[PDB]
Design an enzyme around this catalytic site. Structure first.
Site, short mmCIF file in Angstrom:
data_model
loop_
_atom_site.label_atom_id
_atom_site.label_comp_id
_atom_site.label_asym_id
_atom_site.label_seq_id
_atom_site.Cartn_x
_atom_site.Cartn_y
_atom_site.Cartn_z
N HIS A 41 0.79 -1.21 0.00
CA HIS A 41 0.00 0.00 0.00
C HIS A 41 0.83 1.28 0.00
O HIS A 41 0.28 2.37 0.04
CB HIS A 41 -1.08 0.00 1.11
CG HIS A 41 -0.58 0.25 2.50
ND1 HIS A 41 -0.77 -0.66 3.52
CD2 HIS A 41 -0.04 1.35 3.07
CE1 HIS A 41 -0.36 -0.13 4.66
NE2 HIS A 41 0.08 1.09 4.41
N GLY A 143 2.72 6.19 10.15
CA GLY A 143 4.09 6.03 9.69
C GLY A 143 4.76 4.75 10.15
O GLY A 143 5.89 4.46 9.78
N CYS A 145 3.73 1.70 9.46
CA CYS A 145 3.58 0.58 8.54
C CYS A 145 4.93 0.06 8.05
O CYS A 145 5.86 0.84 7.79
CB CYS A 145 2.67 0.96 7.38
SG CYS A 145 0.93 1.16 7.88
#
Length: 306
Positions: A41, A143, A145
């Site tokens: 993503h 942030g 991820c």
């Protein structure tokens, strides 16, 4: 003595964290040898996330659409491919700090260490258990991820989790390092929610054994139970059913303490029915379920305080 939720030393993992940017989206990546793994993503904006077609979004990117930064050094992407929900970015340099490693898909109830990272920079480390409902109760902000979960066996790092999403209740969802999600979750913004969870029975029993190893027996009793009678109580208190496999797994701890598994189950049944009456076990006022039998053996002395 003492008993804490203990994480594995994070150094071997810290040396693998990098930053990956695509467009205005930046998140963390894991750099092993000549490949950087990150959530796919990273190619989505908040708008794409509503209904992203990853095949279509990715085909529109080139290798230079991705900016990978390891510390102060920029790594050049020379290839990219999608594997389930992860992107595998081939770079022109092999990470000199790559540790011996393995990718493992852990099972519900197992624990692992999480290295929370932001902008490719490690910020904290803590221990998590994969809940029966396939979520983890982590601590993550925007942030995070791409942050990873792992266990260390001798000097081999077994990576088992990459962070992808936060669910409505504040709990988290992610994938193994082959990009397959744990649970029924997907990497798109939908109404998905964590299913009902259950207490990890095997872990609670393991922890009660840890309490005895450390010198406390106040919660034991003169009774025993059959697996079936224990399970009637487990259903009532939303505990996972006890299985014979679980009983077998508890063998070493039962042997070290001299307490038969079903006798410890009778102790647990009583604690569930009568409560803890103002007392504590290993410093806790509640029954802890985030330590596996392996975690207890790893942390506790091999000699019981009789």
């Amino acid at each position: 003595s003492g008993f804490r939720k203990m994480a594995f030393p994070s150094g071997k993992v810290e040396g693998c964290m990098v930053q990956v940017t695509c467009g205005t989206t930046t998140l963390n990546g894991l750099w092993l040898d000549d490949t950087v793994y990150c959530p796919r993503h990273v190619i989505c904006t908040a708008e794409d996330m509503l209904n992203p077609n990853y095949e279509d979004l990715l085909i529109r990117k080139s290798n230079h659409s991705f900016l990978v930064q390891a510390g102060n050094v920029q790594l050049r992407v020379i290839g990219h491919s999608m594997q389930n929900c992860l992107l595998r970015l081939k770079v022109d340099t092999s990470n000199p700090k790559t540790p011996k490693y393995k990718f493992v898909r852990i099972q519900p109830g197992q624990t692992f260490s999480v290295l929370a990272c932001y902008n490719g920079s490690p910020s904290g480390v803590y221990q998590c258990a994969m809940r029966p409902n396939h979520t983890i109760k982590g601590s993550f902000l925007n942030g995070s991820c791409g942050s990873v979960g792992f266990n260390i066996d001798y000097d081999c790092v077994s990576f088992c989790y990459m962070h992808h999403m936060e669910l409505p209740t504040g709990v988290h969802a992610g994938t193994d390092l082959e990009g397959k999600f744990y649970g029924p979750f997907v990497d798109r913004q939908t109404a998905q929610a964590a299913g009902t969870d259950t207490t990890i029975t095997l872990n609670v029993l393991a922890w009660l054994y840890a309490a005895v190893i450390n010198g406390d027996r106040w919660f034991l009793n003169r009774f025993t139970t059959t697996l079936n009678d224990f399970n009637l109580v487990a259903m009532k208190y939303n505990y996972e059913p006890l299985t014979q496999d679980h009983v077998d797994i508890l063998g070493p701890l039962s042997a070290q303490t001299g307490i038969a598994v079903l006798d410890m189950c009778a102790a647990l049944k009583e604690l569930l029915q009568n409560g803890m009456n103002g007392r504590t076990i290993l410093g806790s006022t509640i029954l802890e379920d985030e330590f596996t039998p392996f975690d207890v053996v790893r942390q506790c002395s091999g000699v019981t305080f009789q």
